[PDB]
């Protein structure tokens, strides 16, 4: 399944995922395409922050959902 | 771009607005000219229904960013001229801090030789004795940065900025501008990287004009190709500079636990 | 209301000359344009002839002809600036940049034949090498200010004060406190004004066909503070 991740730098990345995927794995896939380290990533979906150790379906994220990526330099 | 070639030289400009703010119905007409080569816009406006029931400075941003000068190295970020001549729909909500808001919807497009801007504006929740309906804004304008971000999924732009309106008593009334622009045609359009337009304005009066009116001069230059960029919280949609998003989010996520 | 007043009924061409020294960096600027007091409008182009301007262009806007303000009819008895023409006035300032150095300026504003001429000496000291001025951290833009005017009887002129807000690269604001005095050059009678202010607005821009360090400046100035 495909989902999108929208950055504040007006950029849309489309991603290949399964609902069983952990947030940490999704962050890894983001790193894999954009080079951004997982620990600088905060992911938001319908106003909630996605937590490491949970899954795309723990938040009822389906195909074609849009996530919001906010970067956090340090302290992440 | 193709639209781009239309903006060498002086383009005549025509502005029309039908407004309704807190019930008060009004109309404004304007005309002058735009010269993208310098970034220079000159316009004169007449309230044709008589006395403008809001202060002229609050309508400044409502009354053609296609006139900005984009420098050579940023000409591929100029969405406004690329949507020309079919034009674009410009929409805003403008929030006057601790007072009402305007929603605006405009079509900016060529009609033959002239670039026209036609606007419908609806204003609600204003205070009878606020800075807007009480006419407490000075008749002047400051410089702003207009922050632009692509919105691929709309095939257009999201634009955000805050206007600083000086008040007669020395305070400053803020107006948060949440803007987006969409092409009217299906022509291709330049979708830009984050940047800003540097905006400066001066307002005056034609001393042989007894009607209620504004002369406006604008200088606009694209720049900025970032921690100052005004972005929206993905939780509550408020705009703030990028530098503040992390600490805002720490608090905002906890405030809206259901999102 | 004064003799000087009639000199300003149409477009008056303008010449600016500035000799400058800031923390030892010496510089010159020439400028030219026209003002139109009927409308309160001022247009000017300045060229730094010694190379690169060693201070940001906007710090010099106020230094680079308040004789071009539009005084409304019921305020024309308060126009010190035209009343002193054609012989002119001396305009003197100290400008204190917050947390940084200061400018001292002395300028003569007067008609040379039919052009309005502004000749200025500027000295800057105590500037920080990595500060907003010497470090060129100012945005290339300008805001509106009210310029407060008081009569100065003993020196047969005016005292003026205001603060300019200069926007910085990083989104902060840097204040420049202006202390100003204007003193007639001639012996002639002049109008000493009741308290009022000039409402000022400016826009800075570039001539894209100019290759020297330069500034295009548009000013709109209108006297206010006294009711019609
Ligand atoms: Zn929020």
Coordinates of C-alpha atoms and ligand atoms in Angstrom, one line a residue:
Chain A
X1 CA 0.0 0.0 0.0
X2 CA 1.0 3.6 -0.8
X3 CA 0.8 6.6 1.5
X4 CA 2.0 10.2 1.3
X5 CA 4.2 12.2 3.6
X6 CA 3.9 15.9 3.3
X7 CA 6.8 18.1 4.5
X8 CA 6.8 21.8 5.5
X9 CA 9.3 22.4 2.7
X10 CA 6.2 21.9 0.4
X11 CA 7.3 18.4 -0.7
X12 CA 5.3 15.3 -1.0
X13 CA 7.0 11.8 -0.6
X14 CA 5.0 8.7 -1.5
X15 CA 5.9 5.6 0.4
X16 CA 5.4 1.8 0.2
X17 CA 4.0 0.3 3.4
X18 CA 1.9 -2.4 5.0
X19 CA -0.5 -1.7 8.0
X20 CA 1.6 -4.0 10.1
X21 CA 4.7 -1.7 9.8
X22 CA 5.9 -0.1 13.0
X23 CA 6.4 3.7 13.0
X24 CA 10.2 3.1 13.4
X25 CA 10.2 1.1 10.2
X26 CA 8.3 3.8 8.4
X27 CA 10.7 6.4 9.6
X28 CA 13.5 4.0 8.3
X29 CA 11.8 4.0 4.9
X30 CA 11.7 7.8 5.0
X31 CA 15.5 7.8 5.7
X32 CA 16.0 5.4 2.9
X33 CA 14.5 7.8 0.3
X34 CA 15.4 11.3 1.7
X35 CA 18.4 10.7 3.9
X36 CA 16.7 12.1 7.0
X37 CA 17.8 10.3 10.3
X38 CA 14.8 8.6 12.0
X39 CA 15.5 10.5 15.2
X40 CA 14.9 13.9 13.6
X41 CA 11.5 12.8 12.3
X42 CA 8.1 13.5 13.9
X43 CA 5.2 12.1 12.0
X44 CA 1.6 13.5 12.4
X45 CA -1.7 12.0 11.2
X46 CA -5.1 13.6 11.6
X47 CA -3.7 15.7 14.6
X48 CA -1.9 12.8 16.4
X49 CA 1.8 12.1 16.8
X50 CA 2.9 8.6 15.7
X51 CA 4.8 6.6 18.3
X52 CA 7.7 4.2 17.9
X53 CA 6.5 0.7 18.7
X54 CA 3.0 1.1 17.3
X55 CA 1.8 0.4 13.8
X56 CA 0.1 2.1 10.9
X57 CA -3.1 0.3 11.9
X58 CA -2.9 1.2 15.6
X59 CA -3.8 4.6 14.1
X60 CA -6.1 3.3 11.4
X61 CA -4.0 4.6 8.6
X62 CA -5.2 3.2 5.2
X63 CA -4.1 3.4 1.6
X64 CA -3.5 7.0 0.3
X65 CA -3.5 8.6 3.8
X66 CA -1.4 11.7 4.1
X67 CA 1.1 12.0 6.9
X68 CA 2.8 15.2 8.1
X69 CA 6.5 15.2 8.6
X70 CA 8.1 17.8 10.9
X71 CA 11.8 17.7 11.5
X72 CA 13.4 18.3 14.8
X73 CA 17.1 18.9 14.6
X74 CA 18.2 17.7 18.0
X75 CA 16.2 16.7 21.0
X76 CA 14.2 14.3 18.8
Chain B
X1 CA 7.4 30.4 -18.7
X2 CA 4.8 31.4 -21.3
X3 CA 2.7 33.6 -19.0
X4 CA 6.1 35.2 -18.0
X5 CA 6.5 36.9 -21.4
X6 CA 3.3 38.9 -20.7
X7 CA 5.1 41.0 -18.0
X8 CA 8.0 42.6 -19.8
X9 CA 6.8 46.1 -19.8
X10 CA 3.9 48.1 -18.1
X11 CA 0.6 46.2 -17.9
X12 CA -2.5 48.2 -17.2
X13 CA -4.5 46.9 -14.2
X14 CA -8.1 47.0 -13.1
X15 CA -9.4 46.0 -9.7
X16 CA -13.1 45.4 -8.7
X17 CA -14.4 44.4 -5.2
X18 CA -17.8 43.7 -3.8
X19 CA -17.6 43.7 0.0
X20 CA -19.9 42.9 2.9
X21 CA -18.4 43.4 6.4
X22 CA -20.6 42.9 9.4
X23 CA -23.6 43.7 7.2
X24 CA -22.0 46.9 5.7
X25 CA -22.2 46.5 1.9
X26 CA -19.7 48.4 -0.2
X27 CA -17.9 48.5 -3.6
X28 CA -14.5 49.6 -4.7
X29 CA -12.9 50.2 -8.1
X30 CA -9.3 50.6 -8.9
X31 CA -7.0 51.0 -11.8
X32 CA -3.4 51.7 -12.6
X33 CA -0.5 49.6 -13.8
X34 CA 2.0 47.0 -12.8
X35 CA 5.6 46.6 -14.1
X36 CA 7.2 43.2 -13.0
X37 CA 10.5 44.2 -14.4
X38 CA 11.0 46.6 -11.5
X39 CA 8.5 44.9 -9.1
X40 CA 6.5 48.1 -9.2
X41 CA 2.7 48.3 -8.8
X42 CA 0.8 51.6 -8.8
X43 CA -3.0 51.8 -8.1
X44 CA -5.8 54.2 -7.2
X45 CA -9.0 53.0 -5.5
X46 CA -12.4 54.6 -5.1
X47 CA -15.2 53.5 -2.8
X48 CA -18.0 54.0 -5.2
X49 CA -20.7 53.4 -2.6
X50 CA -19.4 56.4 -0.5
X51 CA -17.6 56.0 2.8
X52 CA -15.6 52.8 3.1
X53 CA -16.9 51.2 6.3
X54 CA -13.4 49.6 7.2
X55 CA -10.0 51.2 7.0
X56 CA -8.2 51.2 3.6
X57 CA -5.1 49.6 5.0
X58 CA -7.0 46.4 5.8
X59 CA -7.9 46.0 2.1
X60 CA -4.3 46.6 0.9
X61 CA -3.4 42.8 0.4
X62 CA -6.8 42.1 -1.1
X63 CA -6.4 44.7 -3.8
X64 CA -1.7 40.9 -8.0
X65 CA 1.4 39.1 -7.0
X66 CA 2.1 38.3 -10.7
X67 CA 3.8 41.8 -10.6
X68 CA 6.6 40.7 -8.2
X69 CA 10.2 40.9 -9.7
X70 CA 11.6 37.4 -9.7
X71 CA 15.4 37.6 -10.2
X72 CA 17.0 35.6 -12.9
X73 CA 18.0 32.6 -10.7
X74 CA 14.4 32.3 -9.3
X75 CA 12.4 32.6 -12.5
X76 CA 11.5 29.0 -12.3
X77 CA 9.7 29.6 -9.0
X78 CA 7.2 32.1 -10.3
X79 CA 3.9 30.5 -10.1
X80 CA 1.9 33.7 -10.6
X81 CA 3.0 34.6 -14.2
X82 CA 3.1 30.9 -15.2
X83 CA -0.7 30.6 -14.7
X84 CA -1.2 33.6 -17.0
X85 CA -3.1 34.5 -19.1
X86 CA -5.9 32.2 -17.9
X87 CA -5.1 33.4 -14.5
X88 CA -5.5 32.1 -11.0
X89 CA -8.0 32.0 -8.2
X90 CA -6.6 33.8 -5.1
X91 CA -8.3 32.9 -1.8
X92 CA -7.7 34.1 1.6
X93 CA -8.9 34.0 5.1
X94 CA -7.5 37.0 7.0
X95 CA -7.7 36.9 10.8
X96 CA -7.5 40.2 12.7
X97 CA -6.0 39.2 16.1
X98 CA -8.7 39.6 18.8
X99 CA -11.3 40.7 16.2
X100 CA -13.1 39.5 13.1
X101 CA -12.0 38.0 9.8
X102 CA -12.3 38.5 6.1
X103 CA -12.7 35.7 3.6
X104 CA -11.8 36.7 0.1
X105 CA -12.0 35.0 -3.3
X106 CA -10.4 36.6 -6.3
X107 CA -9.8 35.9 -9.9
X108 CA -6.7 37.5 -11.3
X109 CA -6.5 37.1 -15.1
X110 CA -5.9 38.9 -18.3
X111 CA -8.8 40.4 -20.2
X112 CA -7.1 41.6 -23.4
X113 CA -4.4 44.1 -22.7
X114 CA -5.3 44.4 -19.0
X115 CA -4.7 42.3 -15.9
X116 CA -7.9 42.3 -13.8
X117 CA -8.4 41.4 -10.2
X118 CA -12.0 40.8 -9.2
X119 CA -12.8 40.2 -5.6
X120 CA -15.6 39.1 -3.4
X121 CA -15.0 39.8 0.3
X122 CA -17.1 38.8 3.3
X123 CA -16.2 40.1 6.7
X124 CA -17.7 38.8 10.0
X125 CA -17.4 39.0 13.8
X126 CA -15.9 42.4 13.9
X127 CA -16.3 44.6 17.0
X128 CA -18.2 47.8 16.6
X129 CA -15.6 49.5 18.7
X130 CA -12.6 47.5 17.6
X131 CA -9.6 48.9 15.5
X132 CA -11.4 48.0 12.3
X133 CA -15.0 49.2 12.7
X134 CA -13.8 52.0 14.9
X135 CA -11.3 53.1 12.3
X136 CA -8.3 53.2 14.6
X137 CA -5.7 52.1 12.1
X138 CA -3.1 54.8 11.0
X139 CA -3.1 55.5 7.3
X140 CA 0.3 53.9 6.5
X141 CA 1.8 50.5 5.7
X142 CA 4.9 48.4 6.7
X143 CA 7.1 45.8 5.0
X144 CA 6.3 42.2 5.0
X145 CA 7.7 38.9 4.0
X146 CA 5.2 36.8 2.0
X147 CA 6.1 33.1 2.4
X148 CA 5.3 30.7 -0.5
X149 CA 5.2 26.9 -0.4
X150 CA 4.0 24.6 -3.3
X151 CA 0.8 22.6 -2.9
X152 CA 1.3 19.9 -5.6
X153 CA -2.0 18.1 -4.8
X154 CA -3.9 21.3 -5.7
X155 CA -1.5 22.1 -8.5
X156 CA -0.9 25.6 -6.9
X157 CA 0.5 27.3 -3.9
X158 CA 0.0 27.8 -0.1
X159 CA 1.1 31.3 1.0
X160 CA 1.2 32.5 4.6
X161 CA 2.2 35.9 6.3
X162 CA 1.3 38.3 9.0
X163 CA 0.5 42.0 8.3
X164 CA 1.5 44.5 10.9
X165 CA -1.2 47.3 11.0
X166 CA -0.1 50.4 13.0
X167 CA -2.8 51.8 15.4
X168 CA -3.3 55.4 16.3
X169 CA -2.5 54.8 20.0
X170 CA 0.8 53.3 19.1
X171 CA 0.0 49.6 19.3
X172 CA 0.0 47.2 16.4
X173 CA -3.0 45.2 15.1
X174 CA -1.9 41.9 13.5
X175 CA -3.6 40.2 10.6
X176 CA -2.7 36.6 9.8
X177 CA -3.1 35.9 6.1
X178 CA -3.8 32.3 5.1
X179 CA -3.7 32.3 1.3
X180 CA -3.8 29.8 -1.5
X181 CA -3.7 30.1 -5.2
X182 CA -5.1 27.8 -7.9
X183 CA -4.8 28.1 -11.7
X184 CA -8.0 28.7 -13.7
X185 CA -6.7 26.7 -16.7
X186 CA -5.0 23.3 -17.1
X187 CA -1.9 24.8 -18.7
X188 CA 1.1 23.7 -16.8
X189 CA 2.4 25.9 -14.0
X190 CA 5.7 26.4 -12.2
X191 CA 5.4 24.8 -8.7
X192 CA 8.1 26.5 -6.6
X193 CA 10.5 25.7 -3.8
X194 CA 9.9 27.6 -0.6
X195 CA 10.7 31.3 -0.9
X196 CA 9.3 34.6 -0.1
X197 CA 8.3 37.8 -1.8
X198 CA 9.8 40.9 -0.1
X199 CA 6.9 43.5 0.1
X200 CA 6.9 47.2 0.8
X201 CA 4.1 49.6 0.4
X202 CA 3.3 53.3 0.7
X203 CA -0.3 54.7 0.8
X204 CA -1.3 58.3 -0.1
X205 CA -4.2 60.5 -1.1
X206 CA -4.7 62.3 -4.4
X207 CA -5.2 65.9 -3.2
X208 CA -7.7 66.7 -6.1
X209 CA -9.9 63.8 -5.0
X210 CA -12.8 64.4 -2.6
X211 CA -14.2 60.8 -2.9
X212 CA -13.1 58.2 -0.2
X213 CA -10.0 56.7 -1.9
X214 CA -6.5 55.2 -1.6
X215 CA -3.4 55.5 -3.8
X216 CA -1.2 52.5 -3.3
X217 CA 2.4 52.0 -4.3
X218 CA 3.9 48.5 -3.9
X219 CA 7.4 47.2 -4.5
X220 CA 7.8 43.4 -4.6
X221 CA 10.9 41.3 -5.1
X222 CA 11.2 37.5 -4.8
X223 CA 14.0 36.3 -2.5
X224 CA 15.1 33.6 -0.1
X225 CA 16.6 30.9 -2.4
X226 CA 14.2 28.2 6.7
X227 CA 13.4 29.1 10.3
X228 CA 11.4 32.3 9.5
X229 CA 9.1 30.7 7.0
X230 CA 5.5 30.9 8.2
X231 CA 4.1 27.3 8.4
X232 CA 0.9 25.8 9.7
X233 CA 0.8 23.5 12.7
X234 CA -0.5 20.1 11.3
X235 CA -2.5 19.8 14.5
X236 CA -4.4 23.1 14.9
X237 CA -3.5 24.8 11.6
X238 CA -2.2 28.0 13.3
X239 CA 0.6 29.7 11.5
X240 CA 4.0 30.5 13.1
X241 CA 7.6 30.7 12.0
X242 CA 9.3 27.3 11.4
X243 CA 11.7 27.8 14.3
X244 CA 8.7 27.5 16.7
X245 CA 7.0 24.4 15.3
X246 CA 8.7 21.9 17.6
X247 CA 7.9 23.6 21.0
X248 CA 4.4 24.5 19.8
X249 CA 3.8 20.9 18.8
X250 CA 5.0 19.6 22.2
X251 CA 2.2 21.6 23.8
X252 CA -0.4 21.4 21.0
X253 CA -0.4 17.5 20.8
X254 CA -1.1 17.4 24.5
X255 CA -3.9 19.9 24.2
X256 CA -5.8 18.1 21.4
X257 CA -5.3 14.4 22.4
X258 CA -8.0 13.2 19.9
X259 CA -6.8 15.4 17.0
Chain C
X1 CA 1.7 81.5 4.1
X2 CA 5.4 82.0 3.3
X3 CA 7.6 82.8 0.3
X4 CA 9.3 79.5 0.3
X5 CA 6.0 77.8 -0.1
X6 CA 5.6 79.0 -3.7
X7 CA 8.8 77.2 -4.8
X8 CA 7.2 73.9 -4.1
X9 CA 3.9 74.2 -6.2
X10 CA 5.3 71.8 -8.9
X11 CA 7.9 69.1 -9.5
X12 CA 11.2 70.3 -8.1
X13 CA 14.4 68.4 -9.1
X14 CA 16.6 67.3 -6.3
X15 CA 20.3 66.6 -5.8
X16 CA 21.8 64.7 -2.9
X17 CA 25.5 64.6 -1.9
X18 CA 26.9 62.7 1.0
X19 CA 30.4 62.4 2.3
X20 CA 30.6 59.5 4.8
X21 CA 33.0 57.9 7.4
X22 CA 31.8 54.9 9.4
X23 CA 34.3 53.3 11.8
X24 CA 37.1 54.6 9.4
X25 CA 35.5 53.3 6.2
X26 CA 35.2 56.4 4.0
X27 CA 32.5 56.7 1.3
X28 CA 30.6 59.0 -1.0
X29 CA 27.1 58.9 -2.4
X30 CA 25.4 61.1 -5.0
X31 CA 21.7 60.9 -5.6
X32 CA 19.2 62.6 -7.9
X33 CA 15.5 62.8 -8.5
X34 CA 12.5 65.0 -7.9
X35 CA 10.0 65.8 -5.2
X36 CA 6.5 67.0 -5.5
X37 CA 5.2 68.7 -2.4
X38 CA 1.6 69.0 -3.7
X39 CA 1.3 65.2 -3.3
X40 CA 3.9 64.7 -0.6
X41 CA 5.9 62.4 -3.0
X42 CA 9.6 62.0 -3.2
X43 CA 11.6 59.9 -5.7
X44 CA 15.3 59.6 -5.6
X45 CA 18.2 57.4 -6.9
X46 CA 21.5 57.1 -5.0
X47 CA 24.9 55.8 -6.2
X48 CA 27.8 54.9 -4.0
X49 CA 30.7 56.3 -6.1
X50 CA 33.6 54.9 -4.0
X51 CA 32.6 51.3 -4.6
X52 CA 30.6 49.2 -2.2
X53 CA 28.6 51.0 0.5
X54 CA 30.2 49.9 3.8
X55 CA 26.9 50.3 5.7
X56 CA 23.4 49.0 4.7
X57 CA 21.5 51.3 2.4
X58 CA 18.4 51.5 4.7
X59 CA 20.4 53.0 7.6
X60 CA 20.9 56.1 5.4
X61 CA 17.3 56.7 4.2
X62 CA 16.5 59.4 6.8
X63 CA 19.9 61.1 6.1
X64 CA 19.3 61.3 2.3
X65 CA 14.4 66.8 2.4
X66 CA 11.4 67.2 4.6
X67 CA 10.6 70.4 2.7
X68 CA 8.7 68.0 0.4
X69 CA 6.1 66.9 2.9
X70 CA 2.5 67.7 2.0
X71 CA 1.1 70.1 4.5
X72 CA -2.8 70.2 4.3
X73 CA -4.3 73.7 4.0
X74 CA -5.1 74.1 7.6
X75 CA -1.6 73.2 8.5
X76 CA 0.4 75.5 6.1
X77 CA 1.3 77.9 8.9
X78 CA 3.3 75.1 10.6
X79 CA 5.7 74.4 7.6
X80 CA 9.1 75.4 8.9
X81 CA 10.9 73.6 6.0
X82 CA 9.5 75.6 3.0
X83 CA 9.4 79.0 5.0
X84 CA 13.3 78.8 5.2
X85 CA 13.6 78.5 1.4
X86 CA 15.3 79.5 -0.8
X87 CA 18.2 80.2 1.6
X88 CA 17.5 76.9 3.4
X89 CA 18.2 75.2 6.7
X90 CA 20.8 73.2 8.5
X91 CA 19.5 69.7 9.5
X92 CA 21.5 68.0 12.3
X93 CA 21.1 64.6 13.8
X94 CA 22.4 62.0 16.1
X95 CA 21.2 58.5 15.4
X96 CA 21.7 55.8 18.0
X97 CA 21.4 52.3 16.7
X98 CA 20.3 50.1 19.6
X99 CA 23.2 48.0 21.1
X100 CA 25.5 49.5 18.5
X101 CA 27.2 52.7 17.3
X102 CA 25.8 56.0 16.3
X103 CA 25.7 58.4 13.3
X104 CA 26.2 62.2 13.5
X105 CA 25.1 64.1 10.5
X106 CA 25.1 67.7 9.4
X107 CA 23.3 68.7 6.2
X108 CA 22.5 71.9 4.3
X109 CA 19.2 71.9 2.5
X110 CA 18.7 74.7 0.0
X111 CA 17.9 75.8 -3.5
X112 CA 20.8 76.0 -5.9
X113 CA 19.1 77.9 -8.7
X114 CA 16.1 75.8 -9.4
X115 CA 17.2 72.4 -7.9
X116 CA 16.7 71.5 -4.2
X117 CA 20.1 70.3 -3.0
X118 CA 21.0 68.2 0.2
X119 CA 24.6 68.2 1.2
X120 CA 25.5 66.0 4.1
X121 CA 28.5 65.1 6.2
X122 CA 28.1 61.8 8.1
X123 CA 30.3 60.4 10.8
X124 CA 29.8 56.9 12.4
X125 CA 31.7 55.6 15.4
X126 CA 31.6 52.7 18.0
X127 CA 30.1 50.2 15.6
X128 CA 30.5 46.5 16.2
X129 CA 32.3 44.6 13.5
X130 CA 29.8 41.8 13.6
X131 CA 26.7 44.0 14.4
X132 CA 23.7 44.4 12.1
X133 CA 25.2 47.5 10.4
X134 CA 28.8 46.7 9.7
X135 CA 27.7 43.0 9.2
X136 CA 25.0 44.0 6.7
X137 CA 22.3 42.2 8.4
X138 CA 19.4 44.6 7.6
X139 CA 16.7 43.6 5.3
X140 CA 16.4 45.8 2.2
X141 CA 13.1 47.3 3.1
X142 CA 11.5 50.2 5.0
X143 CA 8.5 50.8 7.4
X144 CA 6.3 53.8 8.3
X145 CA 7.1 56.3 11.2
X146 CA 5.7 59.4 12.7
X147 CA 8.3 62.2 12.8
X148 CA 7.4 64.5 15.8
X149 CA 8.0 68.2 15.4
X150 CA 8.3 70.9 18.1
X151 CA 9.3 74.6 17.7
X152 CA 12.7 75.7 18.9
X153 CA 12.2 79.5 19.6
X154 CA 15.7 80.3 21.0
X155 CA 17.4 78.8 17.8
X156 CA 14.6 80.0 15.6
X157 CA 13.9 76.5 14.2
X158 CA 12.6 73.1 15.2
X159 CA 13.4 70.0 17.3
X160 CA 12.4 66.7 15.9
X161 CA 12.4 63.1 17.2
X162 CA 11.4 59.7 16.1
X163 CA 12.6 56.0 16.0
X164 CA 13.1 54.1 12.9
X165 CA 12.4 50.3 13.0
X166 CA 14.9 48.5 10.8
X167 CA 14.0 44.8 10.1
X168 CA 16.9 42.4 10.5
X169 CA 17.7 39.2 8.4
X170 CA 16.8 37.0 11.4
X171 CA 13.4 38.4 12.1
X172 CA 14.4 40.7 14.9
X173 CA 13.9 44.5 14.8
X174 CA 16.7 47.0 15.4
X175 CA 15.8 50.6 16.6
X176 CA 17.5 53.8 15.4
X177 CA 16.7 56.7 17.7
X178 CA 16.7 60.0 15.9
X179 CA 17.5 63.4 17.5
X180 CA 17.2 66.1 15.0
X181 CA 17.4 69.9 14.9
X182 CA 16.7 72.3 12.0
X183 CA 18.0 75.8 11.9
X184 CA 17.4 78.4 9.1
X185 CA 20.4 79.5 7.1
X186 CA 19.1 83.0 6.4
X187 CA 18.0 86.0 8.4
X188 CA 14.5 86.0 7.0
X189 CA 11.4 85.4 9.0
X190 CA 10.4 81.7 9.3
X191 CA 7.3 79.8 10.5
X192 CA 7.7 78.2 13.9
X193 CA 5.2 75.4 14.2
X194 CA 2.8 74.1 16.9
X195 CA 3.5 70.5 17.8
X196 CA 2.6 68.1 14.9
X197 CA 4.1 65.1 13.1
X198 CA 5.0 64.0 9.6
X199 CA 3.5 60.7 8.7
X200 CA 6.3 59.0 6.6
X201 CA 6.3 55.9 4.4
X202 CA 9.0 54.5 2.2
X203 CA 9.8 51.8 -0.3
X204 CA 13.3 50.8 -1.4
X205 CA 14.1 49.2 -4.7
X206 CA 16.7 48.6 -7.5
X207 CA 17.3 49.8 -11.0
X208 CA 17.9 46.4 -12.6
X209 CA 20.0 48.1 -15.3
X210 CA 22.3 49.7 -12.7
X211 CA 25.5 47.8 -11.9
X212 CA 27.0 50.1 -9.2
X213 CA 25.9 49.7 -5.5
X214 CA 22.7 51.8 -5.4
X215 CA 19.3 52.5 -3.9
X216 CA 16.0 53.7 -5.4
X217 CA 13.9 55.4 -2.8
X218 CA 10.3 56.4 -2.8
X219 CA 9.0 58.5 0.1
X220 CA 5.4 59.7 0.9
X221 CA 5.3 62.3 3.6
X222 CA 2.2 64.1 5.0
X223 CA 1.9 66.4 8.0
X224 CA -0.8 65.5 10.6
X225 CA -1.6 65.8 14.3
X226 CA -3.6 69.0 14.0
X227 CA -7.4 68.6 13.3
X228 CA -9.3 70.0 10.3
Ligands
LIG1 ZN1 -0.9 23.5 16.9

